[PDB]
Amino acid sequence: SLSDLLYEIQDKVGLLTMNRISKHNAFDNQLLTEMRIRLDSAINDTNVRVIVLKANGKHFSAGADLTWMQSMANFTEEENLEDSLVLGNLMYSISQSPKPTIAMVQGAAFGGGAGLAAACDIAIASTSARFCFSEVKLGLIPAVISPYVVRAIGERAAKMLFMSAEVFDATRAYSLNLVQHCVPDDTLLEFTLKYASQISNNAPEAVKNSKQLAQYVANKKIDEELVRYTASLIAHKRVSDEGQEGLKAFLNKEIPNWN
């Protein structure tokens, strides 16, 4: 049985569940390779609109797997490059998903696991969740996760937390925008499934286009060129089949055909 990483689809939501309960989902290249494959499947499955990364057991990910760490300590630089590109490709693939991505975090998310929350569009934490970029304690650096963390929480906060390796709680992760929702422990799953379903029931092209739009306008000069571009984008969407359906459904008080 393939039991380390579970994959199922519910109501247009693809759910990847880290399931190394006894090892607290501690990362190694094997688990991360499984994640890459399942993520690729979900991204390419027309039956999936929203992707959720979640975990069973006490912790989202307690850190790095101890067997893997001993192996990695003996790697050459070239072997380390290959190994690091497993996480590197996973995080890149998450960030490149045209579909909405959500991380659901309970307990500890230490190291790579904290990075997964940053790579996803949205992260939802239970009140008891805790985060840490622990690498400097080992004489290492959080290199692979850093672009995603710096994007999510900003250079100032990221620099602090990388240098200190301090543990920060779910409230702190929320105030820093690493997570956007902080919800009761015993209903984390229920909240997440409902929230993902709500996004999956919005107009699917509009949702994907809105993701692309936010990404595109970010850090561009707000000039007349950009204004004209944005106006043409909505003009095109209004006459699209989906936009016309959405408007008709709203004006007639009927259910849109994408649901």
Side-chain angles (χ1 to χ4, degrees):
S1 178
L2 285 150
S3 57
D4 280 9
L5 183 78
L6 307 172
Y7 179 53
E8 75 170 311
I9 301 162
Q10 293 179 23
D11 181 36
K12 304 191 179 299
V13 182
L15 302 161
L16 282 72
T17 307
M18 293 177 295
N19 194 47
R20 289 193 182 177
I21 292 170
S22 68
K23 300 263 178 58
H24 299 147
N25 295 316
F27 278 13
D28 63 33
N29 56 297
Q30 185 182 297
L31 179 67
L32 298 170
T33 293
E34 295 208 50
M35 296 184 63
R36 289 180 69 190
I37 296 169
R38 301 303 189 174
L39 173 71
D40 184 75
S41 293
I43 287 171
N44 291 115
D45 191 345
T46 57
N47 295 319
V48 174
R49 288 180 184 169
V50 176
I51 298 168
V52 174
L53 311 181
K54 63 183 180 72
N56 288 333
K58 299 182 181 311
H59 302 297
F60 187 76
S61 178
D65 181 271
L66 288 174
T67 303
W68 170 86
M69 187 169 339
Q70 179 62 84
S71 296
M72 173 278 279
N74 295 143
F75 287 170
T76 65
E77 192 171 357
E78 184 46 60
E79 288 167 340
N80 279 134
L81 175 65
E82 298 200 27
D83 174 84
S84 290
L85 285 163
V86 179
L87 178 66
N89 279 309
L90 175 61
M91 299 268 291
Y92 185 67
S93 290
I94 292 163
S95 74
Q96 288 288 302
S97 174
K99 306 176 180 183
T101 54
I102 295 167
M104 175 184 125
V105 181
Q106 91 286 10
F110 292 171
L116 296 187
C120 288
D121 297 319
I122 299 159
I124 299 168
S126 60
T127 58
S128 291
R130 305 110 44 182
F131 297 84
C132 187
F133 312 114
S134 53
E135 288 75 7
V136 297
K137 288 173 176 153
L138 268 41
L140 302 177
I141 56 173
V144 168
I145 68 172
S146 66
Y148 310 97
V149 175
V150 170
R151 184 170 68 183
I153 70 171
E155 183 192 338
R156 187 171 181 78
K159 196 186 335 113
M160 174 179 85
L161 299 165
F162 294 167
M163 296 188 306
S164 73
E166 71 201 274
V167 178
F168 57 106
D169 66 17
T171 300
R172 191 51 168 142
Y174 178 88
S175 65
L176 292 177
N177 285 352
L178 179 58
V179 307
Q180 294 104 317
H181 303 274
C182 184
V183 301
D185 291 358
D186 293 344
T187 46
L188 177 63
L189 179 60
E190 291 85 344
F191 179 93
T192 297
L193 293 180
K194 285 205 181 168
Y195 184 80
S197 290
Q198 286 157 2
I199 298 170
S200 78
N201 293 312
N202 293 154
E205 295 310 309
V207 166
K208 296 188 280 187
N209 291 171
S210 292
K211 179 166 177 171
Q212 193 185 340
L213 171 77
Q215 292 167 330
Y216 177 81
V217 304
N219 320 117
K220 285 194 168 59
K221 185 182 177 180
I222 304 172
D223 57 14
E224 295 205 296
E225 185 175 82
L226 189 66
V227 177
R228 292 190 303 266
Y229 166 94
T230 60
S232 74
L233 206 67
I234 179 62
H236 196 72
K237 193 76 178 76
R238 283 172 178 179
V239 302
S240 73
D241 291 347
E242 188 184 80
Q244 286 288 304
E245 167 68 9
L247 285 160
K248 199 223 294 160
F250 181 84
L251 292 165
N252 298 347
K253 292 156 179 162
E254 294 169 345
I255 305 305
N257 66 201
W258 61 77
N259 291 153

